[PDB]
Design brief:
This is part of a larger assembly, with chains A, B, C, D, E and F. By secondary structure, chain A is of the alpha+beta class. Chain A has a three-stranded mixed β-sheet, covered by helices on one side. In chain A, a hairpin with a 4-residue loop joins strand 2 and strand 3. Chain C has one domain: GMP Synthetase, Chain A, domain 3. Chain F is mainly beta. In chain F, the strands form two sheets. In chain F, strands 1-2 form a two-stranded antiparallel sheet. Classes of the chains: A alpha+beta, B alpha+beta, C alpha+beta, D alpha+beta, E alpha+beta, F mainly beta. Bound molecules: magnesium ion (2 copies). The structure holds one RNA strand. Chain E: This is Small ribosomal subunit protein eS10.
RNA sequence: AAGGGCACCACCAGGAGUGGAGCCUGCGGCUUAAUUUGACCAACACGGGAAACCUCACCCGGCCCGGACACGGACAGGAUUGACAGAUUGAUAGCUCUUUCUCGAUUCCGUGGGUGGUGGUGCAUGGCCGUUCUUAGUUGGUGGAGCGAUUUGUCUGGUUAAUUCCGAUAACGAACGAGACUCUGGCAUGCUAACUAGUUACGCGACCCCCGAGCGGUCGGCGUCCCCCAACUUCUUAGAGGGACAAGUGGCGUUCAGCCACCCGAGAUUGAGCAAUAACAGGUCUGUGAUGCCCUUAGAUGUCCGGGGCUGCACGCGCGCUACACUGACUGGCUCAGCGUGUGCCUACCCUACGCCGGCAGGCGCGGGUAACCCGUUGAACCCCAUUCGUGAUGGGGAUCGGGGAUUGCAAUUAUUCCCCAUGAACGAGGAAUUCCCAGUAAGUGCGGGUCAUAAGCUUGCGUUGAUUAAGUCCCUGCCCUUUGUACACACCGCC
C-alpha cells in the first residue's frame, strides 16, 4: 500500500492523478516530459513481462539510467542496474515505488578500515 | 557515431559550455562585463584592453 | 536601446577587438617589421592604421597583401562592407620601437647568428 | 526646423574628453548657439581583481585592475535647425560619441 | 574527408571569389556563418582548407580562435581549372577596378 | 589493456555485381520487378527494397509493410 | 663573538582568538575499478579547484577519424557512403549480424608521412609569478693600492624610515634602488556646469491648530528645460586649479644636516601601486594554436557518448563558521549606508518595480531599466526602544535524523538549493602550544562582486558600530652596517 490504495488500483492509476500520490520530487519529475529513453525502457520491461513464462520471474533487463523513478507497472521485473562497473540485478518490491533505481545498486563498497600507513604521524 | 549521438549531450549551460575566447580554456573564466577571457589571458592582455593598475 | 549593449560592455568589446587585432597583426606581420596598431573609429566608419617598418613589404603586388588583410578583417569581425580602411604607416626612428627591435633580434637568431 | 539635440562623449581618459568638451563648445559659441552646460556624469570604475600567479602557488597576491569610464553630456539648443548647421564632429580616436535628439 | 561535391564547389568558389576566407575553430559548429544558404558544416570546410594547405594552394594564419587562410598564386590556376574557368575572372584582391 | 571482448568485427560489404534487377521480354517489354518509392525526394527513378515482409526506399526511408 | 641600528610575518603591555565541541572545506592515511593530480615561513577555503552531466584529466563500456599529402592497387560493368525492419545493444550507436535499397569518385586498402593528446619531463625550457627582500642595498668608467683574487670610491662621526642627508676623505665623476612618481582620503560656502543631481523661493494642493494666529506645522504630493514657463549650486557629481613646506615660534643640535614641543591650519606620517643587482634545479609543459625531447595515435593516452568517482571513512592535521548565553534569546515597534551589478558574437543564461494567488519556499500578468533616467531615496544588519523568558545543557546550541511542499536542469539517488512541522547531541570559555594587530585600527555587524542553469561557511571589496593597550626594547624569533675568528663554500641542515 503506497498511499493507502492497493497495487491493483495503482496498475490502472493514470499518470495525471498518479502525481498527486507521489512526493514533490517525483511529481515534478513526472510533470516534466519523460524522454524517449525512459519510454523505450518501459516498453522493454512490458515486452519482457508479457513474454515471461507464467508463475515464473521474467528475464534480466539491463540499463545505465538509474535516475528512472519506479512506476507501479514495473513491479516484478528483473532489472539490472549499473553500478559503474557491472550491472546489479534487483527485484522491484511493492514498497519501492517512490524510490529511484540508483538507490539499490550502490556505487561503492563499504570501507573495511585497515592499519594506517605512513601518514598521520 | 552518426549525428544523433556525436554531439547529443546538451551543453546549453554549465562549465563545459564556456571556454576562453583566446585559449579556449575551461578553468578560471571571467564572465564579468562579457569579457569571456581566461584568467591567464586576461593578465596577459589587460594592458591591451585597457585595464591598468592604479592601486 | 535594446539593440545596443551597455557602455561598459561596449568599452570591454572595444578592448577585446583591439587586443585580438594586435595579436593577428603580430602573428601575421612578424617578418614585415611590425611595430604596433592604431585604430580610429567613427560612427561613419572605422580606420585601422598599422605601424610597421617595411611598408613596401607588407603591401603586396599593387597592394595585394593589404587588400588581403582588409578582406580578412572585414570577414572576421563582421563590419558593414566598405566601412573599414587599412593604412600602413612607416614608423619614425625604428630603433626606438622595442617590438621591432625584438622581432629583428628574433630574425637574427633564426638566421643562425650567435 | 525646431530642434533640440543631445551630444554625449565618453572615453577612458580625461584629457581628450576635456579638450573635446572645450573646443566643441567654443566652436558653438563662435557659431552663436546657446549651450546647455556640460554635465560630467559620475565615473564608472570597472574593477577586476585577479591573482598574480597563473598557478596558485605563492603568497596569495591579488592583482587589481581598473577602467575609468568618464562621460560628458552637452546639449546644443538653437532657435533654428541644428543638423544642417553643424555637421563636423572633429573626433579623435579613443573617444565615443552618440548624437541623439530630444525625441530620442 | 567524406564531404560531397555540391558543397566542395561552393566552398571553392567562395574561396576564389575573394582572395581569402575566415573560419572560426569550432569542429562542432552546426553552420559556417557565411555561405548561409548552402547548409555546410564547419568541419567540412575546415578539413577542405586543411587539404588545400597540405597541397600548398593556400597558406594559413591562426589567431586566438580563428583561421585566416590566404589563397596563393598556386591556388589561382588550381581553382581555375577545377572550376573550368577561363583566365580572365580573378579574385577581388588580385584586380580592383582595372 | 587485455580487453575482455575480442576486437569487434567491422562490416565488410557484399561486393554486389552488376545490378540487373529488371528484365524485358520478347524483344522489349519493361517489367518493374522492384517497388517504386512514391515520394518526391525518392523520385520515380530509384527503386525500393524487396525485403521478405516490407519495402524500403533508399532516399525516402519509408517502410511499406505487407502482411 | 663584539659594537650600532631596525621589525607586532619579534617581544613587551594588552585586545581578539586558534588549539577544547558541532559543522563546512583542503591535505595525509584507510578503503575502492576509480577515489585524477600538483603543491608539504615560501603547501594544506591553494591551483581563482563552491565536480550530479560537461568540467575530467580516474574507472567500467560503446561509436566515429575529425589518419592531411604523396606513391601504388582498387574501381562508374561500382572506389565506396547512409539506412527501414528484426534480433544484438544501456542506447532509436546500420555498432554487428539476416535482409535488401540507396550516395557516387568526395572515399577504401597498403606504404611513408602527418596530426593530436589536461600524456610524461618545471632537474630541458620561454613567459608568468612567489621567495631571498620590501630590508636598503647594488654597479660602471677614470684614478689610488695590492703579483693577484680583490680593495678605495660604497666612509670615523652626526642624522634619517632610507650609503636619507651633512660632514671628512685617494678619490673624482656617475647610475639604479630609496626618494621622487600615479591613484586614493581629508579642506576648500573659491571658478565651471547642471530636467539622467539637487537646494531655495513661489503657485496648486492634502491633513491638523483652527480658540486665532496662517510668512503656523508636514508631504520622497503635483509644477515653474513642457520652452519662456523662478532663481541658485551650499548639499551631489567631475574638471581646471589652489592648499602643507618642518613653513612660523621656543628648545636641542658641530648650531650644519636634522630632532622635540607649540600656534595657526582640514591635514604637521592616508592607505596603496610601481618597485635595484644577483639568485632558487621554488610552482606551473593541467592557461595557451608557448614549447624542445620521449610515449601513443585506430582495440586511441585523440575525440564523442552512457554511467560511476573526484564527497567515498577505525584516524591525524590546516583555514574557517557556529556557539557555549541575561553585556543574552525571542516577539513587536522605531531608525541610518557604501562600494558595485544588471538582458549576452559563439552563449540559451539579466536586474527587477507593481498587481493577484499561496502560510512559506514559489507561481500567475502587467511594466521600467543596455542604466546618476528602473530596481533605489538601495527603508541592510549591528544597534535603539518595549514584551516574555530566569542561571537550568533552560526559550542558549541546532548538529543528526523523519515526513511533506517548491525552485533549476536532460537528469536532484551518494540527499543541488529553498521552505514547513518534527529531535535537540556535544558544547557550561577550552592543556601544552600558537596566530594577527597601533586609530576608524582590532573586533562586532551586515551588503555587493567572483565562482552561478541552481547556488557561499571561501575570497575580493564595501559600508555600519567601535575600543583597551603602547609611542619602547633586543629578551625570543629574525634583518641591515662595521669589526673579529673559521679547518664552511651544496656555505652550521656545514665540516669533522
Ligand atoms: Mg525557543
Ligand atoms: Mg686564528
Amino acid at each position: 500500500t503506497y498511499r493507502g490504495v492497493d497495487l491493483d488500483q495503482l496498475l490502472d492509476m493514470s499518470y495525471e492523478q498518479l502525481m498527486q500520490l507521489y512526493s514533490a520530487r517525483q511529481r515534478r519529475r513526472l510533470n516534466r516530459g519523460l524522454r524517449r529513453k525512459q519510454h523505450s525502457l518501459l516498453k522493454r520491461l512490458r515486452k519482457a513481462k508479457k513474454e515471461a513464462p507464467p508463475m515464473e520471474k521474467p528475464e534480466v533487463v539491463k540499463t545505465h539510467l538509474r535516475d528512472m523513478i519506479i512506476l507501479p507497472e514495473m513491479v516484478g521485473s528483473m532489472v539490472g542496474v549499473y553500478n559503474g562497473k557491472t550491472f546489479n540485478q534487483v527485484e522491484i518490491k511493492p514498497e519501492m515505488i517512490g524510490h529511484y533505481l540508483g538507490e539499490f545498486s550502490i556505487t561503492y563498497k563499504p570501507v573495511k578500515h585497515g592499519r594506517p600507513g605512513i601518514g598521520a604521524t | 557515431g552518426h549525428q544523433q549521438l556525436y554531439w547529443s549531450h546538451p551543453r546549453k549551460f554549465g562549465q563545459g559550455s564556456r571556454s576562453c575566447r583566446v585559449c579556449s580554456n575551461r578553468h578560471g573564466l571571467i564572465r564579468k562585463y562579457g569579457l569571456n577571457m581566461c584568467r591567464q589571458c586576461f593578465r596577459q592582455y589587460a594592458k591591451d584592453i585597457g585595464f591598468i593598475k592604479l592601486d | 536601446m535594446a539593440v545596443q549593449i551597455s557602455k561598459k560592455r561596449k568599452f570591454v568589446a572595444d578592448g577585446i577587438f583591439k587586443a585580438e587585432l594586435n595579436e593577428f597583426l603580430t602573428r601575421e606581420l612578424a617578418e614585415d617589421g611590425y611595430s604596433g596598431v592604431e585604430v580610429r573609429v567613427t560612427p561613419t566608419r572605422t580606420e585601422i592604421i598599422i605601424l610597421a617598418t617595411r611598408t613596401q613589404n607588407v603591401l603586396g603586388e599593387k597592394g595585394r597583401r593589404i587588400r588581403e588583410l582588409t578582406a580578412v578583417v572585414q570577414k572576421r569581425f563582421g563590419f558593414p562592407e566598405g566601412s573599414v580602411e587599412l593604412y600602413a604607416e612607416k614608423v619614425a626612428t625604428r630603433g626606438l620601437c622595442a617590438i621591432a627591435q625584438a622581432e629583428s633580434l628574433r630574425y637574427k637568431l633564426l638566421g643562425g647568428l650567435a | 526646423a525646431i530642434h533640440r539635440i543631445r551630444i554625449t562623449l565618453t572615453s577612458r581618459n580625461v584629457k581628450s574628453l576635456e579638450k573635446v568638451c572645450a573646443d566643441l563648445i567654443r566652436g558653438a559659441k563662435e557659431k552663436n548657439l546657446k549651450v546647455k552646460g556640460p554635465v560630467r556624469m559620475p565615473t564608472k570604475t570597472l574593477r577586476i581583481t585577479t591573482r598574480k600567479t597563473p598557478c596558485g602557488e605563492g603568497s596569495k597576491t591579488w592583482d587589481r585592475f581598473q577602467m575609468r569610464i568618464h562621460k560628458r553630456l552637452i546639449d546644443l539648443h538653437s532657435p533654428s535647425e541644428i543638423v544642417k548647421q553643424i555637421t563636423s564632429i572633429s573626433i579623435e580616436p579613443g573617444v565615443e560619441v552618440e548624437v541623439t535628439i530630444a525625441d530620442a | 574527408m567524406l564531404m560531397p561535391k555540391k558543397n566542395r564547389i561552393a566552398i571553392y568558389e567562395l574561396l576564389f571569389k575573394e582572395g581569402v576566407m575566415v573560419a572560426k575553430k569550432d569542429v562542432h559548429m552546426p553552420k559556417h556563418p557565411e555561405l548561409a544558404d548552402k547548409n555546410v558544416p564547419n568541419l567540412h570546410v575546415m578539413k577542405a582548407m586543411q587539404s588545400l594547405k597540405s597541397r600548398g594552394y593556400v597558406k594559413e594564419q591562426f589567431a586566438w580562435r580563428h583561421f585566416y587562410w590566404y589563397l596563393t598564386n598556386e591556388g589561382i590556376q588550381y581553382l581555375r581549372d577545377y572550376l573550368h574557368l577561363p583566365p580572365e575572372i580573378v579574385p577581388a584582391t588580385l584586380r580592383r577596378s582595372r | 589493456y587485455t580487453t575482455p571482448k575480442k576486437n569487434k568485427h567491422k562490416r565488410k560489404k557484399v561486393k554486389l555485381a552488376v545490378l540487373k534487377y529488371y528484365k524485358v521480354d520478347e524483344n522489349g517489354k519493361i517489367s518493374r520487378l522492384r517497388r517504386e518509392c512514391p515520394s518526391d525526394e525518392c523520385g520515380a527513378g530509384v527503386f525500393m527494397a524487396s525485403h521478405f515482409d516490407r519495402h524500403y526506399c533508399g532516399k525516402c526511408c519509408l517502410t511499406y509493410c505487407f502482411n
